[PDB]
Amino acid sequence: SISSRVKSKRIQLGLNQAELAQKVGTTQQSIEQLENGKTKRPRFLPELASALGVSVDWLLNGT
Amino acid sequence: SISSRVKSKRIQLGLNQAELAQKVGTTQQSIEQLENGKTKRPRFLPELASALGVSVDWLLNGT
DNA sequence: AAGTACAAACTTTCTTGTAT
DNA sequence: TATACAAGAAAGTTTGTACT
């Protein structure tokens, strides 16, 4: 899902949610809600795909 | 400018607002908020760049 | 301590209807 | 016909707190 892919992703890189956000330049909260399934399309969607270093499509559809 | 660029392709590509909208899966009225600086980060940024057949970075950074 | 969640108030982006 | 405006709501963001 986008929420899941992200959580696993954010982990192969070790970043906890607090530093992940640090990197997209956004709250710890916002990173949370996303993982948690309480947001489908975080306005910061291209900022976090840089970070995970995967491409938005992949993040979005899991390809 | 996000909306510059956007506008300019549609004219290029030969469609009007609606078309493309119906194409992007959105609305004539949405293609306006964006196009007319009324929107920055659309929930269709992505679905639009494929439609718009250019890069999502390109829409924002135009880079 | 450290890190992940929660929930309310506010903000942007969407949606529908009509005006130009 | 084709682009624009405008009011209500929804989807996201915030920020302060709370859990564990």
PDB file of C-alpha atoms (C1' of nucleotides) in Angstrom:
ATOM      1  CA  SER A   1       0.000   0.000   0.000  1.00  0.00           C
ATOM      2  CA  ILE A   2       1.536   3.434   0.085  1.00  0.00           C
ATOM      3  CA  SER A   3       1.496   3.308   3.799  1.00  0.00           C
ATOM      4  CA  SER A   4       3.112   0.055   4.016  1.00  0.00           C
ATOM      5  CA  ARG A   5       5.781   0.250   1.294  1.00  0.00           C
ATOM      6  CA  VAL A   6       6.858   3.428   2.996  1.00  0.00           C
ATOM      7  CA  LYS A   7       7.314   1.792   6.505  1.00  0.00           C
ATOM      8  CA  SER A   8       9.325  -1.048   5.211  1.00  0.00           C
ATOM      9  CA  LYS A   9      11.223   1.357   3.035  1.00  0.00           C
ATOM     10  CA  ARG A  10      11.896   3.836   5.730  1.00  0.00           C
ATOM     11  CA  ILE A  11      13.376   0.908   7.550  1.00  0.00           C
ATOM     12  CA  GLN A  12      15.823  -0.546   5.034  1.00  0.00           C
ATOM     13  CA  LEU A  13      17.327   2.742   5.542  1.00  0.00           C
ATOM     14  CA  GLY A  14      17.158   2.729   9.377  1.00  0.00           C
ATOM     15  CA  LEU A  15      15.546   6.158   9.590  1.00  0.00           C
ATOM     16  CA  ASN A  16      12.918   6.314  12.282  1.00  0.00           C
ATOM     17  CA  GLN A  17       9.922   8.342  11.518  1.00  0.00           C
ATOM     18  CA  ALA A  18      11.347  11.298  13.317  1.00  0.00           C
ATOM     19  CA  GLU A  19      14.418  11.625  10.923  1.00  0.00           C
ATOM     20  CA  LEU A  20      12.523  10.606   7.842  1.00  0.00           C
ATOM     21  CA  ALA A  21      10.420  13.625   8.226  1.00  0.00           C
ATOM     22  CA  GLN A  22      13.533  15.666   9.007  1.00  0.00           C
ATOM     23  CA  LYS A  23      14.567  14.796   5.466  1.00  0.00           C
ATOM     24  CA  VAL A  24      11.296  15.511   3.587  1.00  0.00           C
ATOM     25  CA  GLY A  25      11.172  18.713   5.706  1.00  0.00           C
ATOM     26  CA  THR A  26       7.852  17.991   7.541  1.00  0.00           C
ATOM     27  CA  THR A  27       6.434  16.840  10.987  1.00  0.00           C
ATOM     28  CA  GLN A  28       6.863  13.548  12.701  1.00  0.00           C
ATOM     29  CA  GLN A  29       3.103  13.317  12.770  1.00  0.00           C
ATOM     30  CA  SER A  30       2.572  13.596   9.037  1.00  0.00           C
ATOM     31  CA  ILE A  31       5.065  10.897   8.381  1.00  0.00           C
ATOM     32  CA  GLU A  32       3.095   8.790  10.879  1.00  0.00           C
ATOM     33  CA  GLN A  33      -0.441   9.192   9.627  1.00  0.00           C
ATOM     34  CA  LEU A  34       0.841   8.241   6.231  1.00  0.00           C
ATOM     35  CA  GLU A  35       2.279   4.862   7.372  1.00  0.00           C
ATOM     36  CA  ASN A  36      -0.784   4.396   9.579  1.00  0.00           C
ATOM     37  CA  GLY A  37      -3.184   4.619   6.690  1.00  0.00           C
ATOM     38  CA  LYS A  38      -4.772   7.833   7.705  1.00  0.00           C
ATOM     39  CA  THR A  39      -3.717   9.822   4.401  1.00  0.00           C
ATOM     40  CA  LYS A  40      -3.577   8.660   0.793  1.00  0.00           C
ATOM     41  CA  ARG A  41      -1.676  11.422  -0.863  1.00  0.00           C
ATOM     42  CA  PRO A  42       0.555  13.439   1.217  1.00  0.00           C
ATOM     43  CA  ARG A  43       1.295  16.718  -0.520  1.00  0.00           C
ATOM     44  CA  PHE A  44       4.872  15.898   0.143  1.00  0.00           C
ATOM     45  CA  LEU A  45       4.641  12.742  -2.058  1.00  0.00           C
ATOM     46  CA  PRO A  46       7.522  13.759  -4.302  1.00  0.00           C
ATOM     47  CA  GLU A  47       9.603  14.738  -1.411  1.00  0.00           C
ATOM     48  CA  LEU A  48       9.466  11.483   0.198  1.00  0.00           C
ATOM     49  CA  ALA A  49      10.006   9.445  -2.795  1.00  0.00           C
ATOM     50  CA  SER A  50      13.503  11.189  -3.134  1.00  0.00           C
ATOM     51  CA  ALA A  51      14.181  10.281   0.405  1.00  0.00           C
ATOM     52  CA  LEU A  52      13.235   6.521   0.115  1.00  0.00           C
ATOM     53  CA  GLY A  53      14.840   6.985  -3.223  1.00  0.00           C
ATOM     54  CA  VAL A  54      12.180   5.106  -5.101  1.00  0.00           C
ATOM     55  CA  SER A  55       9.946   6.721  -7.632  1.00  0.00           C
ATOM     56  CA  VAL A  56       6.476   8.034  -6.819  1.00  0.00           C
ATOM     57  CA  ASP A  57       4.734   5.528  -9.135  1.00  0.00           C
ATOM     58  CA  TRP A  58       6.408   2.561  -7.152  1.00  0.00           C
ATOM     59  CA  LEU A  59       5.446   4.202  -3.920  1.00  0.00           C
ATOM     60  CA  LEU A  60       1.929   4.826  -5.174  1.00  0.00           C
ATOM     61  CA  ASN A  61       1.104   1.500  -6.893  1.00  0.00           C
ATOM     62  CA  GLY A  62       3.843  -0.604  -5.515  1.00  0.00           C
ATOM     63  CA  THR A  63       4.360  -1.675  -9.161  1.00  0.00           C
TER      64      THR A  63
ATOM     65  CA  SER B   1       5.787  28.372 -13.068  1.00  0.00           C
ATOM     66  CA  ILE B   2       3.903  25.203 -12.162  1.00  0.00           C
ATOM     67  CA  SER B   3       0.781  26.520 -13.950  1.00  0.00           C
ATOM     68  CA  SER B   4       2.779  28.072 -16.819  1.00  0.00           C
ATOM     69  CA  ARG B   5       4.308  24.847 -17.818  1.00  0.00           C
ATOM     70  CA  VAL B   6       1.026  22.985 -17.270  1.00  0.00           C
ATOM     71  CA  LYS B   7      -0.855  25.377 -19.518  1.00  0.00           C
ATOM     72  CA  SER B   8       1.798  25.377 -22.155  1.00  0.00           C
ATOM     73  CA  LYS B   9       1.686  21.639 -22.625  1.00  0.00           C
ATOM     74  CA  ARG B  10      -1.970  21.375 -23.039  1.00  0.00           C
ATOM     75  CA  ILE B  11      -1.976  23.899 -25.756  1.00  0.00           C
ATOM     76  CA  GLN B  12       0.940  22.029 -27.296  1.00  0.00           C
ATOM     77  CA  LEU B  13      -0.692  18.548 -27.055  1.00  0.00           C
ATOM     78  CA  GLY B  14      -3.844  20.094 -28.643  1.00  0.00           C
ATOM     79  CA  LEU B  15      -6.384  19.590 -25.865  1.00  0.00           C
ATOM     80  CA  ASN B  16      -8.331  21.992 -24.063  1.00  0.00           C
ATOM     81  CA  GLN B  17      -8.932  22.094 -20.291  1.00  0.00           C
ATOM     82  CA  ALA B  18     -11.838  19.472 -19.888  1.00  0.00           C
ATOM     83  CA  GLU B  19     -10.328  16.935 -22.321  1.00  0.00           C
ATOM     84  CA  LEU B  20      -7.156  16.600 -20.558  1.00  0.00           C
ATOM     85  CA  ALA B  21      -9.083  16.829 -17.318  1.00  0.00           C
ATOM     86  CA  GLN B  22     -11.274  13.817 -18.424  1.00  0.00           C
ATOM     87  CA  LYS B  23      -7.908  12.451 -19.470  1.00  0.00           C
ATOM     88  CA  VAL B  24      -6.186  13.165 -16.037  1.00  0.00           C
ATOM     89  CA  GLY B  25      -9.347  11.843 -14.361  1.00  0.00           C
ATOM     90  CA  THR B  26     -10.076  15.143 -12.743  1.00  0.00           C
ATOM     91  CA  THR B  27     -12.227  18.223 -13.581  1.00  0.00           C
ATOM     92  CA  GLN B  28     -12.364  21.101 -15.861  1.00  0.00           C
ATOM     93  CA  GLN B  29     -12.523  23.149 -12.668  1.00  0.00           C
ATOM     94  CA  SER B  30      -9.447  21.554 -11.308  1.00  0.00           C
ATOM     95  CA  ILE B  31      -7.422  22.104 -14.352  1.00  0.00           C
ATOM     96  CA  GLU B  32      -8.264  25.756 -13.757  1.00  0.00           C
ATOM     97  CA  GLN B  33      -7.210  25.984 -10.120  1.00  0.00           C
ATOM     98  CA  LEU B  34      -3.955  24.568 -10.943  1.00  0.00           C
ATOM     99  CA  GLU B  35      -3.408  26.346 -14.337  1.00  0.00           C
ATOM    100  CA  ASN B  36      -4.526  29.570 -12.692  1.00  0.00           C
ATOM    101  CA  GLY B  37      -2.138  29.452  -9.684  1.00  0.00           C
ATOM    102  CA  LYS B  38      -5.066  28.437  -7.543  1.00  0.00           C
ATOM    103  CA  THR B  39      -3.476  25.036  -6.788  1.00  0.00           C
ATOM    104  CA  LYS B  40       0.162  24.011  -6.058  1.00  0.00           C
ATOM    105  CA  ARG B  41       0.163  20.422  -4.983  1.00  0.00           C
ATOM    106  CA  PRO B  42      -2.692  18.521  -6.746  1.00  0.00           C
ATOM    107  CA  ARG B  43      -3.845  15.106  -5.691  1.00  0.00           C
ATOM    108  CA  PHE B  44      -3.327  14.365  -9.383  1.00  0.00           C
ATOM    109  CA  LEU B  45       0.196  15.730  -9.681  1.00  0.00           C
ATOM    110  CA  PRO B  46       1.172  12.262 -10.609  1.00  0.00           C
ATOM    111  CA  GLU B  47      -1.751  11.113 -12.592  1.00  0.00           C
ATOM    112  CA  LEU B  48      -1.263  14.375 -14.626  1.00  0.00           C
ATOM    113  CA  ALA B  49       2.375  14.055 -15.515  1.00  0.00           C
ATOM    114  CA  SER B  50       1.747  10.832 -17.239  1.00  0.00           C
ATOM    115  CA  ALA B  51      -1.234  12.283 -18.866  1.00  0.00           C
ATOM    116  CA  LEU B  52       0.856  15.408 -19.508  1.00  0.00           C
ATOM    117  CA  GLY B  53       3.568  12.801 -20.497  1.00  0.00           C
ATOM    118  CA  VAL B  54       6.377  14.862 -18.879  1.00  0.00           C
ATOM    119  CA  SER B  55       8.187  14.443 -15.423  1.00  0.00           C
ATOM    120  CA  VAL B  56       6.616  15.198 -12.031  1.00  0.00           C
ATOM    121  CA  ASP B  57       9.805  16.937 -11.101  1.00  0.00           C
ATOM    122  CA  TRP B  58       9.373  18.923 -14.292  1.00  0.00           C
ATOM    123  CA  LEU B  59       5.923  20.057 -13.205  1.00  0.00           C
ATOM    124  CA  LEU B  60       7.181  21.609  -9.950  1.00  0.00           C
ATOM    125  CA  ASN B  61      10.780  22.302 -10.597  1.00  0.00           C
ATOM    126  CA  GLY B  62      10.555  22.251 -14.361  1.00  0.00           C
ATOM    127  CA  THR B  63      13.824  20.565 -13.865  1.00  0.00           C
TER     128      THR B  63
ATOM    129  C1'  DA C   1      14.417   8.432  27.896  1.00  0.00           C
ATOM    130  C1'  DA C   2      13.216   7.700  22.953  1.00  0.00           C
ATOM    131  C1'  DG C   3       9.857   7.118  19.434  1.00  0.00           C
ATOM    132  C1'  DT C   4       5.382   6.172  17.807  1.00  0.00           C
ATOM    133  C1'  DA C   5       0.454   7.628  18.034  1.00  0.00           C
ATOM    134  C1'  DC C   6      -3.751  10.731  18.862  1.00  0.00           C
ATOM    135  C1'  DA C   7      -7.050  14.362  18.137  1.00  0.00           C
ATOM    136  C1'  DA C   8      -8.562  18.877  17.490  1.00  0.00           C
ATOM    137  C1'  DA C   9      -8.167  23.419  14.754  1.00  0.00           C
ATOM    138  C1'  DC C  10      -6.783  25.161  10.883  1.00  0.00           C
ATOM    139  C1'  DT C  11      -5.163  25.144   5.767  1.00  0.00           C
ATOM    140  C1'  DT C  12      -5.273  23.672   0.884  1.00  0.00           C
ATOM    141  C1'  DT C  13      -7.364  21.150  -2.845  1.00  0.00           C
ATOM    142  C1'  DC C  14     -11.821  19.218  -4.641  1.00  0.00           C
ATOM    143  C1'  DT C  15     -16.124  19.310  -6.042  1.00  0.00           C
ATOM    144  C1'  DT C  16     -20.483  21.433  -8.054  1.00  0.00           C
ATOM    145  C1'  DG C  17     -22.971  25.076  -9.715  1.00  0.00           C
ATOM    146  C1'  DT C  18     -23.289  28.971 -12.154  1.00  0.00           C
ATOM    147  C1'  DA C  19     -21.243  33.224 -14.417  1.00  0.00           C
ATOM    148  C1'  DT C  20     -18.457  35.118 -18.442  1.00  0.00           C
TER     149       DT C  20
ATOM    150  C1'  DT D   1     -18.331  26.244 -26.851  1.00  0.00           C
ATOM    151  C1'  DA D   2     -14.227  27.081 -23.507  1.00  0.00           C
ATOM    152  C1'  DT D   3     -12.272  29.286 -19.323  1.00  0.00           C
ATOM    153  C1'  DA D   4     -13.222  31.312 -14.853  1.00  0.00           C
ATOM    154  C1'  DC D   5     -15.230  32.275 -10.261  1.00  0.00           C
ATOM    155  C1'  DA D   6     -16.983  31.213  -5.818  1.00  0.00           C
ATOM    156  C1'  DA D   7     -18.992  28.741  -1.451  1.00  0.00           C
ATOM    157  C1'  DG D   8     -19.125  24.474   1.126  1.00  0.00           C
ATOM    158  C1'  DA D   9     -16.763  20.073   2.315  1.00  0.00           C
ATOM    159  C1'  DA D  10     -12.799  16.862   2.569  1.00  0.00           C
ATOM    160  C1'  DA D  11      -8.563  15.683   2.431  1.00  0.00           C
ATOM    161  C1'  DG D  12      -4.145  16.854   4.492  1.00  0.00           C
ATOM    162  C1'  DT D  13      -1.159  19.411   7.811  1.00  0.00           C
ATOM    163  C1'  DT D  14      -0.067  21.127  12.784  1.00  0.00           C
ATOM    164  C1'  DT D  15       0.961  21.254  17.234  1.00  0.00           C
ATOM    165  C1'  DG D  16       0.631  20.063  21.461  1.00  0.00           C
ATOM    166  C1'  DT D  17       0.078  15.854  24.338  1.00  0.00           C
ATOM    167  C1'  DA D  18      -0.066  11.065  25.433  1.00  0.00           C
ATOM    168  C1'  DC D  19       1.009   6.745  25.477  1.00  0.00           C
ATOM    169  C1'  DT D  20       4.035   2.678  25.669  1.00  0.00           C
TER     170       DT D  20
END
